[PDB]
Design a protein around this ligand. Sequence first.
Ligand code: NAG
Lengths: 171, 55
Amino acid sequence: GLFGAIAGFIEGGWTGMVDGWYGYHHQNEQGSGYAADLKSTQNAIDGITNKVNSVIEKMNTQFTAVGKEFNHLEKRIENLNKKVDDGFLDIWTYNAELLVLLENERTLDYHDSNVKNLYEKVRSQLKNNAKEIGNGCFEFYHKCDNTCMESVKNGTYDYPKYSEEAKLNRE
Amino acid sequence: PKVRDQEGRMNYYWTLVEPGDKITFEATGNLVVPRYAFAMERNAGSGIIISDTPV
Ligand SMILES: *[C@@H]1O[C@H](CO)[C@@H](O)[C@H](O)[C@H]1NC(C)=O
């Protein structure tokens, strides 16, 4: 996309991660599995929910009847009424078509942005204790147990703690 | 020209009467006098639907 993460440097998506839209997949000595990041998932949910409502509910109409009846000696104002009805039809069709075209692009970029930013929050924590092996994965230069995993996701990874071990494994 | 076997014609007319007003008919012939009127009160403007769709 624009941010180049979805269908970009992260090739595909995970049918296994069912907790949310964005998350992690880890494996270490004591197991493996998926886990969604709810902080970014909820923000996207709260944001997309507000976006659909803003398109639906900023449309408010009043009671009106479109049916006007004109006899055979009123063809002029009957064609005028047709020009009004056909005029509103052309506008509301072009607006709705272009709106859904444009905002579908924006929404797919918004999900691309969230994956990119979620990736940078992890990269800027594991500065050189982990290896950017590409494909949106990090290989740690140290043993990272399930306690350590839950801290990278939480955003509280202790760099000075594991910097000692990762220095020597880099060789 | 004959329309439903009638060489003649008959125009129809209508008008509204305000609450507390009078209407006067007067003719020496050719008047189709009213028999039933309608005490009405028209609410917001609506339309008319023409369709074979059932109710
Ligand atoms: C997660 O981050 C919060 C931030 O205040 C911190 O208090 C907490 O100790 C961290 N770890 C866990 C397991 O929640």
